[PDB]
Specification:
This is Serine/threonine-protein kinase DCLK1. The chain has about 100 residues and is of the alpha+beta class. It is built from 1 helix and 4 strands.
């Protein structure tokens, strides 16, 4: 209720429909800690295999540099080595994940 919820996708991955992260001082006190956790949750042997290196806005036009740039209910794209790939990441994903808890 009091945490900032955002939804992370994987760059160039047309199938994964995102994971919700609760961002609060209590859960991620630092940017590096957030990226390390994103690698743990999202990086596998074929999807972002080198690890998460970058968080993009949904349009791919900005790389996030600080936790305050993350906005409640917005969606972000985790990138690794390849540049941002424009996909309809959020299509058909109901926004209730950002409303009821």
């Amino acid at each position: 209720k009091k945490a900032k919820k955002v939804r992370f996708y994987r760059n160039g991955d047309r199938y994964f429909k995102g994971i919700v992260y609760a961002i609060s001082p209590d859960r991620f006190r630092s940017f590096e800690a957030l990226l390390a956790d994103l690698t743990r949750t999202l990086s596998d042997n074929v999807n972002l295999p080198q690890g998460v290196r970058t968080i993009y806005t949904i349009d791919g036009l900005k790389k996030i540099s600080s936790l305050d740039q993350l906005v409640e209910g917005e969606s972000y794209v985790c990138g690794s080595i390849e540049p941002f790939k424009k996909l309809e990441y959020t299509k058909n994903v109901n926004p209730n994940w950002s409303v009821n808890v």
